[model samples]
Structures are given as structure tokens and as C-alpha cells.
Target: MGLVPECFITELVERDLKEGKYAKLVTRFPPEPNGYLHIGHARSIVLNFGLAQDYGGECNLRFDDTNPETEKEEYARAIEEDVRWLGFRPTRVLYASDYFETMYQCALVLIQEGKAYVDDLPEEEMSELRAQGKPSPYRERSVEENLELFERMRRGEFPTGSRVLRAKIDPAHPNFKLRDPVLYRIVHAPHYHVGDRWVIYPMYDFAHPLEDFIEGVTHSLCTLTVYDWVIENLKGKCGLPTSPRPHQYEFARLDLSHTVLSKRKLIKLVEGGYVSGWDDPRLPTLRGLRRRGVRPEAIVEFVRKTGISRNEAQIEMDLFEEVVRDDLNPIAPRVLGVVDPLKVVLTNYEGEEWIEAPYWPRDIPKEGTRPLPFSPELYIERTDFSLNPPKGWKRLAPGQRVRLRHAYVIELEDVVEEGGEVRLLKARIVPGTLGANPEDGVRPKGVIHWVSARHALPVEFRLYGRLFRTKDPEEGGDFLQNLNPEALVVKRGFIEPSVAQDPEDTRYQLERLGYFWRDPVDSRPEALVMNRIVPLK
Candidate 1:
């Protein structure tokens, strides 16, 4: 697997040591417990986890649940589960809620040192300050008086939005972020992790830097979006020997075509009941991909091929499919299945007769040939026949000789129709012919798959397709509009006897159809449920 080349890790380590950042590398994944993670998170998780594994250091799983108003245990648990499902081993489990007391103390220290103060400015005033790029009304608070106010806020004496602890930075700084930003806010909501023990919460900027400090994290890599905020608030808190300086580095997030990875939209889908849940296979959650029969190794491969760059652009869905197909094609076993049935009767075959045949794919280790039941009554794919030939049409047609793949050659004798809808096909099975011959001679122009009509099994087959029609779905329009109406097309399909009898663990590719793994959630030997990950064609 090209998931992680050993040489790449070696080169990165050598560079980090030479630059005098740290003797060893350490990374942290701090996801806010507000919503389910999307594929955009996978790129970051891999980088942090992969780097930690490579440098023999540590990667921390931290929940930034400072805002209890929206944070919940459901999201915290999911973040941990997704990380583990992606095959990451976290060094420690930390939560920002766990450090709220220490953060309060830090704010107090800043206040006494005249670097922070309490701001009773309303939301309107704050908005005006940001718009006008001017000083805050509470910018000139005295160190002693601000310390007293900060203590009162921590004691829960001040109502929410009535008072906020603001960092006493430059009011006239070119970088507006240095213009006395809010350090802490009073929120009455109960925290999921910390509970009602604290009434105040630290903002993302303040809590993230402190979380890194508490966990001894060095070189806190973040996205380009948060780099400026982190740099302004965290640059020189603690120097040399305190687990190295935790400088932030920015990287790009993967954006796929016709796919929406925004947490807000995903939440809307869940809340609006547009999807069953976060793990709906069509929803792009990691579990969704896993349940859809996509191999974890393929995901790592796609991430590798997608490349790690700062430039942002939408990737095509076919490119993603290409990587998945590349990974699964060589491994999936071949079977015969017909999605839409067109019943065909072999006139000369005796009733209740069956034929034993070998499964086509014999590459997988320990795989053996199988026998299939064949009856006079058989079913073929409806798409395999065309009443009107479009010149290039090579499949079964009126009076055309077509071979039943892996069986025998048959001529389209007649068609049965009910009010313009074609029903059944009557055909004559010719012996010793191209499709019917045991020897390879006199080949038919086209070969199509079939199953004994009497032996066919009823199954719910999910025709997996791209969730969106466009490559970059979430770019501009309402992703709901870009939704591919054909994302899922369910139909009852027939399979060869060998496939029906094979163990559920056995993966198969339907001759011309694509690879399909037995749906672990619904597939059973008695009544099988199969999910199609992708199509080979």
C-alpha cells in the first residue's frame, strides 16, 4: 500500500530535528464536540496520527467542548470512534472542559498583570468595534479593578452576556485580533464533559492554546483559517524546555466533487430528516463509507493519491472511485448477477435440470470452482436485449444469436409483451456452440449473464452511485439540488447457485457488474442483503 512511504517519514523527522523545533514530534486532533465529522476531517486525522506513529511520539484526542450550548456527548463519542475506526491510536484522551478551572486561573493572572479586563459591552457594541476597527469601551480597565470583575464573573455573580473577560491588548493594533479580543464568556448551559461545575467558558482561541499547553503539545498544526488567531494569542506563552514551542502549521482540507462535507449542512440533513442518521451510507460519514463495503486501506490509498498540498480545489468523484476500484478489483471474486430480470426459456432443456459451473475469478487464494443450477427457465438482464438495434448494438436482439455467458449460445426466438412492456423471451439453446461449448471455438459476438429462473434468490440490491451530480457539490449551489436522484436504485436481483451458497465473507464481482461485498448489516444465508460499493463498467 502507498499509504505512507517509509522514506517520507524519515525525511520529515530529519528536517524537524535540524530546524531545532523539537527532538521528537507530537500532534493533537482537537475536534469540537458540536457535530459529526466529515471526510474533510480524515485528511487532518491521518496527518496527525501518521506523523505521531512515524516519529514514535504521541497524538492526543482532545474534545474542545467549551461551548456547552451546542456541545454534546454524542459528538465527543463519535469523534473518538471515527479516529479509532480510521486506525489511529491516541496517546491520551483530553477535553477542554477538563481545563476550565485552570483557564479561569490563567485569565485571572492576565487580569492582575494588566493584560486582560472585563468588558460589559453589548453584542451591538462588539459588532460596531469589529466593523469600525476601533478600541473597545473596556480597553482601559485598571489591572486591580479588572481582577475583581474577573473573579466575580467566575463566581457566577454576573449573568451571561452581562460581562466578558477580554484580553487587554493594543486597541490601535493593525491586526484587529490584537484589539482586545474576548478571553472568556459567561454561558449558563451545562457542559457535557464538565457538567454544571462551571458557568463560564473559554473561547476557541483561548481554550485551544491552553489545551495544547496542558497536554505538552509542540508545533500545534492547524488549518490556514485558524493560523492567524492562534499565532496572535499563543506565540510566546512558555519558552524553551516546556515540551518545545507549540507553533501552528496550516494544511489543506480535501473537498470532493458533488459532495458536501460541511458540518452545518450535515447537521441540517440529520435534523431535517433528509437522511436516516449521520452514518447513512449516502451521508459521507466514515462509518457510512465503512458500511458501504469500502475497505479502510482504499481510503488511506485515496488520501495518499489526493496529495497533501495547501492549494484548494474540488476533486472529481470518479477519481475517488478510480482509487477504490483500483484497490478492490484485484481482490473481489467474480459472480453472475442480474439486476433487472428478463425471463428466458430454453425450449429443448428438460424440466428440473441443473448444470454445475465454476466461478470465473480464481485468483484469490484458496478459492475453488463452484456448481450452478441451470433450468429450462432462466432470467437475463433486461438491459441485455434491444428490440430496435442502434447499429452498434451487439447484445441480444430480434433473430440475433447471443451466447449465455459461461453456459450456451441461444437465438432470440420470440418476445412476450404486455401492452408494449416486454415480458419474457423464448429462445432455442444450441449445443456445441460458442457460449454453450466446453471448448473455445466459434465465439459469439456478445456474452451476457443469466441465472436459473427456478433457482433465483430474492435480494435487495442497492445500486450505488455518486451522491451528487457535480464534482464539487458544496461549492456554490444548495447541495440538495445537486443530489443525484439515482444515488440509490434498489431492485431484486438473481445470482448463480454458487454465489448464493458461498459464505458471506466471500466477496464477488458480477461478471460485467462491479464488486459487491455481502452487506454485513443485513445479509444472512437464509435471506441475503447485498450492497454495491461501485460498478466496474
Candidate 2:
């Protein structure tokens, strides 16, 4: 694992320490509780938690639930669960809602100092004026009147969207965000964390910095998109202590090729039934990745290897897959499985005998063996046996010899067809091939995996591909138009009896196939379902 790098953020923390910007450091991973956490969020989560651990400081897991309309209790709960699953426990759990009273007081300070005022302009008019670089007509309202109206708005006197509190920063400022940004808005919706106790809510620009300040967050890390707004507006107007206030830092967010990281697009995908749910294996959500048998360690290592650069780029899915394979290679156990089974009758093998096969290959040092039942009847992958194999074909073909993985060398003698499709194969297993080569001094060119027909368990294998067809799904057309038609492919398969019985704590790598895991939610002992984690060479 290339763990979190000591990059620009590390330099900044060092500088803060040198400048005595506080005795100890503090950071936060503040996410809006509107939707499920995605792969994009894993970077931030790992950075915050990793930084805290590295520095012997503390990281707070905070929810910025300023907009109650989209926020939900379920989403918040899911976010917390995802954070914990990622292998970090926050020093404390904090919410922006918990500091609403402090935020209101901060707004009062701005109002009394004539640095903020209440505005009643409709959203359309406000947008028009802002586009023209003009101030609102209510910009000159008296402090007393602004304070009184703000109190009325907080008391639920005004309907939603009728009034808003804005910082009285220079409307003529070069940066549009510093030009009198809205600090508070009227919304009568019930908040998930606090319920309907309050109708008015502080805007994110208003609450985020205050939430950090109240918690004494020394380094507020976020994506590049919100860096300027948080620094120029929240810290500029929130009246935080000048010396010890939290300083915001920006980094590139994780963006994968052929995927959409937008929360809005993800919500549309979920609600539109394009995906089964947020946890659909095709989704980039944490729940989806976990359900798809992606270990959190692989995800963390993937983000770590991406580095903490300020520039944005679309990462290839192959790089992510490489990290997953690296994390899983040593741990996953090998087993025999056939996705598309074809009956193979071993005419020469008469009696039933079982071979104890090592669960791990020689490269893997782990110890364990599974009893592989050997019989005259076996199942091999249909694709492995070609009626007319091309030149240099390694797999089984008519009169061709191939080694049955961990069992014996077998030669195909005959093929049985049904409706123009070859359904079965007849083969003869060479004697004394187990744990050795053929006695006739012939070397087989190929090795294939098989499961005993009498001992194999029927299973459903779900193979997933990239969810999007193009390199950038959001470019050139509607994102949904680029959805991959073959994102998920299901097959009726068979697993060896050893695999069927042993519920190994780690993932399973089917020989010549991909890694797999039982569907934690849908799989049962009687009816097995495995999700293909990824394909192998």
C-alpha cells in the first residue's frame, strides 16, 4: 500500500507548526448528508483520518446538514457506517446543526456591526442583479430593521424563500463569492438531525467555517471547488478569531474514467431505476464497492497511490483494478469453478478417489488443503474445449491432452452435440498423473480447472463491468445515454464442494477465473450467489 503521501498538505501542516498556529492540529471530514458516500469521498476520508493518526492529532467526522430538503436520517446513518468501514474512528462526531445557535449569534454580531443585512429580493431578481454585478435594493436597510426582520424570519413569520440574510461584503469585490454572499436562508423543512424545532437555517458558507471554529479545527481540507468561497466568505465574515481560525486547503477530488462522481447524477441513476439501488455493483458508491467484494484496503491504497495533487485528472479503471488485485492476491484462496459448464466423462477413470489440493498456490505461503473429489464424471468450462481449436491452442480439443488442474492429465476422445451445440465431452484420464506428469513421457500444453459432477454445487455468478461506456460519460451527451448495456452479466455456474462448504473469512479466487465473494445480503446456504470481484488473465 502506497499510503497517504506527505505532500503539500504535509508541508502546510509543518508551516503551521513552525508559525505556532496552535499547539495541536485538528482536521475534519465534513460531508453533506444528502446522499450515499461515493468512491470520490474515500480520498478525503483517508486523508483526514490518516493525517490525524500520523500527526497524533484528532479528526472530527462532521455532517454539514444545512439544507434539510435533500438531507435524510438514512443518508447520515449510511455515511457514518461507511466512514467506520473505511477503518477509521473519528475523535468525535459533530454536526453543523448542533452549532446553529452559535451560528445565529455570529450572524447577530455581523448584523450589529453593519457587516450583514436581511434581503427580501426574490431569487430571480437576485440572480439578475448579481449577474449585472449590482447590489440588492435592500442593501441599505438599517441594522435595527435588519436585526428585527431576521428575528421574524427565524420565528417562522415568513414563508420559505421570502427572506434571506446576506453578508454585507463589498458587492463590487472582484471575486463574486465575496460580493455579499448569502449567510442564512428561510426554509421551514424539518432537519434530519434537529427535526422541526427551527425553520430558518444557516447557509453552508455561513455554517461550515463556524462549525470548524467551534470545534477548533486547525486544518479544514476540501476539494478545489469550494476553496475560495470558504476562505473568502466564511472565514472573512464569520468573525472568527484572527490568529487561531481554521485555514482551508484544497486538493484534487478523485475522478475515475467512464464514471460520474456527481451526487445529483448518482441520485438520478438511483431514483430512475437505472441502478438497482445505491449499492448496485455498477455504482461507484462505497456500498456498491463493498457489495461487489472490493476490500476497503484496496480502495484506501488506490486513493493513496493517486497522490494529493492540486490538479484534477480522470484515473483509468485499470489502475484501480491493479490496486485491488495487489491487495487481494496474497489473501484470496484458489478454488475450481466453471461458469459455463460442459459435462466431461472420464471413461478411463473407474473408481472414486479424492485428491487433497492446496487451497493456496506455491507463491502464496499460507497453509491449508481442500479435499477435491475425483470421479469419472466432471464439469469443465465449455469455452475450454474447442471442436476445431486454432494452431497452438493450449486448452482441450479433439485428441488433445490437457492437465486437469490439481487432478490429472486427460485427453479428449469424443464430443457430443445437441442442436448444433456441443453439450458434453468424453475424455480419458491418464493413470499416475496426479502429483506427476503422464507415464508415457508426453507433456500436456494446457491446464484447465474442473469440478466433480457429483460433488459440485450449483451457483449463480454475477459478473460486473464498467457502468459507463465512454471515457467520460458526462461528455458529448446525456450521461445516462452512455450507460454500459453489459454492465452486469449473470451466469449459472458450479463451485467445488470444498468451496461450497468452507466459508473462508477472505475472498475466493476461482482457478483461471476471477475473485468472488458470496453476496452478503442475498446468498443463502441452500441457494448460493457469488459476485465476481474482477477478472483474471
Candidate 3:
């Protein structure tokens, strides 16, 4: 609920503004269109959009779709929806592919200035030479011949991987990134945005700064760096804006325990069939959390608490669960449910009567109660009763008395058994004990929740736990090795019938069990599907 607190980024912004480096700030959230946005990406959006609001500036959403082999129109389309779902509207939405013609001209300008040339080195040979801090023979080609070759390469005259345009930077630089980095490559694949219009594609480092400068970005906030070199050499060229030039700032990405955030590993998990899909509740995708009943407001708060410092460490998953629990406690209504049911027949009960039960606990400030039918036949949690009671057990046992939640007290009279298993229980309701003690004044054991047998709804509970066993999923070198086999345990359960009138996608606190959400994709009025978000701590 609070705005992004003051961080080191704010300090830099204040200094830049005082120095008259542009009137206001303009930031961008640029993500490659190869995978869906996850929890980590949410932190970036909050910082970008929150800064725009704080400084009274603008923020643009840009898709860095330079690599056509992995980027797609489908992923780009979904990214817009993901941003909208997080309650943000970009000042301008664009793709790096939109500036394809402008980028081509910039490459040409570099070539004319003798800063870049066409190289026919194979990929392996280029890597080997770069590692040894050596330059290839193509670095000395005349500008005239290099231009002619580049034009021909754009016209599909050469196959991919045979020729590339590289910057003529210092080959003896210690950092391998500055050692003659490739600027453009010949790829014959069709771009999703512009179908087969051109075969030449610019690398990410080459296209990123140009896109930022074209959009007139004042401050570019991202996790990594590489755009500084591009802006330094290509400034005031190809009709680019010379003032309010974009500057990149580095930040640390969000890393969490018990899960992997790498796109490569996520792809492996999906392709290996380790999960249902990207939206599976066990995965860490934003849609996965949404389907599991997590609210956007809670996510904003969680990111704020995680801090935006440069420290890189794995955060414990308990903090996430704690935030979710605190968010749902005051809003979610409480309802009765039985996960593993055990039939209980009331011997001294005849007809049914509606008993009013509060939808919220006493600590909550709500004042709503729904009428729950109390009948002679009821179902209680199977774990609530034990034939041979163990020590320290406070639930129902043989010859024990217990109080039904918000209902009357019942005494266990006998049990109906089959094959040495207690299949069902028989009990008798004590008189005048609905809201008070019985006339006999007998002490009762701890209370337990139950649902009427005839007036309950059959529900499918998809109970979920940590997806990985170890704190770090990649501990054993293979993420699948730490995969929790029992991450998801489905159970057929029953809930009170009062929920039938509630709207779909409603979240509720199943009494004594956990917080549950109606599965929007699979739940229906006839066959209800409920996902357990977290346990009652």
C-alpha cells in the first residue's frame, strides 16, 4: 500500500535533476519476449512505474525482441496483459523491431567511420580469437568493400553464420565483451512483427541503446549493463536525439530459495514435463500465483519488503507465505470443510434445523453469518477421531465428548467397524448444548469442524507444497533431482452448501484446513475445484 520507499536510485535521481540533466525522468521496462513474466519481473515493474509516479514523469513498456529465433508474437501479446493486470498503463508501448530501419542506418554510420567491418569468421573461430585477445584479418577491410558486402548480406545473398558485422574495438581489452563484439548477423528467419522483410538482425547490445535513445529515455533502469558502449560511440549519429540521452543503471535480480528463476531452467522444466504448464500452481510464474489466490496488492507489499539493494542472496519462501497469510486474514470468510471424511450419525437427532454461524472469526471485524443446516447425518474430518487415542491427543476418541463447531455438543456412543478399520462413528447430541453447557454438566474435548452430509458440496482440493525439497533447487547440479514428488496431493472433500450462492473465483478460509481458491479454469457449479493456497499457521 505504500509507495516505493527511498532507495539508492532515488539518491541518484535527485542529483541528476539538480544538475539540470533533463527536466523530468523517463524510464522503461524492457523485457525480451521469450518467456512469460514471473515474480522477479514484478519487482522491476513496480520500480519503473513507481518512479514515474513519484517524479511526475513517464514510463514506457518496450519489448526487446531482437532475437527472432526465440522471440514470438504470442509472448509479446501476453506481456501487455501481464502489465495491465499489475495496475499499470505504459505511456508508450513499442518493440525493438519497430526501429529496424533506423538501426540499419546506425550500423552503416559506424562502418563509414571505420569503427566496424564485415567479418566472415565462423562462430567458433570468432570465439577462439576473442578469447586469445586477437583480431581477425577482416578488421582491416576497406570501408567501401565492407559496405558492399553488408548490403549484399541484407539482400539474402549469404547464408546465416557465414558472415557478421563486428565493431572494431580494442582486441586486447581485458573484458571479453569489449573485444570486437558482433553488431549484426545474417539470419534468414522471418520476424514475427515484420514477416520476411529483411534477413539482417541487430544484436541486443546494438539495438537496445538505439531503442532507448529513440524513445528519449532519460534513465534506463535494468538488472545488467552493456548499452553504455553503444551510446558512447553512436551518439549524434543516424539522426538520433543528442540531448536527454538514455543512461543505464544496474540492479540485482530477485532470487528465491526452493525455486529456479532462470529462463533456461524454466524451459527445461516445462519441456521435461515436470509440471503441467507455465500456469501450473507449483511453478513461480505470475499466472501460477494468481491462480493460487494471491492478490496483486500483496505482491506489491512483498517486493517492497524484499528491498531494492544490490545484495544478492536467496530469500526464504516463508516470508512469501507470511505475507499472503496476513493479507487474507481479514478478508477471507471462514467456512466448514472436511478433507478426509468420516460419517457420524447422530442417534438422538431426528430432523434438520438451520444454525446461524459467523462467516468470520471473533478477531475479525466483519459481522456476517450464514445459516448452515444441522442434520442427523454429518461428516467430520477423519483425522479428528482415533480409535486407539495416542498421548496428548485432544480430539475425539472412544467414550469421549466433543463440541461441534458453532453447534451442539456430542458424546461418542459407539463405532461401526469393518476389517479392523473404524469406518464410521455413532454419537448422540447432548440436550440444551447448542450455545451452552448441557444439563448434565459434562466437560467436552476440543471443538472440531464438520459439514452436513446431505447439504454439502463435493469439492476437489488440490493441496500444494514446496515444489523443491532442498533450499537451493540446483544444489545437486540437476534441478529435477531436488523436485518434491509429493508437491501436489489431490483430495476429494466436502464444503458447506452456503458457498454455492457465492460468485466464482471466490477465496475462503476452509475452517481448520487452509485458505482455498476456486479454480477459475476448472471449477464449475457441479464439480467444484478448490486450490489450497497456504495452511492455517
Q: List the residue pairs that clash in candidate 1.
A: 219-246, 257-471, 257-472, 258-471, 258-473, 333-509, 408-436
Give the Cα error of residue 250 in candidate 1, in Å: 0.8
- Model 1: per-residue Cα lDDT at residue 140: 84
TM-score of each: 0.91, 0.95, 0.96
Q: Rank the candidates by TM-score, best first.
A: 3, 2, 1
Q: What is the per-residue lDDT of model 1 for residues 317-365, given as tens digits with 9 covering 90 to 100?
A: 7887888888887777677888888899878777675555555455555
**Candidate 1 lDDT for residue 4:** 43
lDDT of 2 at 150: 95
Tens digits of per-residue lDDT for model 3, 255-282: 8888888888888888999888888888
lDDT values, one for every candidate: 0.75, 0.86, 0.87
Give the better candidate number (1 or 3) by TM-score.
Answer: 3
Per-candidate clashes come to 7, 0, 0
Name the better of 2 and 3 by lDDT. Answer: 3
What is the C-alpha lDDT profile of model 2 across 1-537, one tens digit per residue? 324697999878878777887778899999999889999999999999988887778999999999989988788889999999999999998788988887888788878878799999999998788877899999999999999999999899999999999977777777778778898898989988988888989887778777888788899898872334444444544556555677788899788997898878888998999889989888999999999999998998898888897878789988988888888889888988899999999888787888989888888889999788889999999889888899989999986799999989989888888899998888898877888988778878889999999889999999888898898885547888889988988999898877656764458999898889898778777878998888875
Error in Å for residue 491 of model 2: 0.7
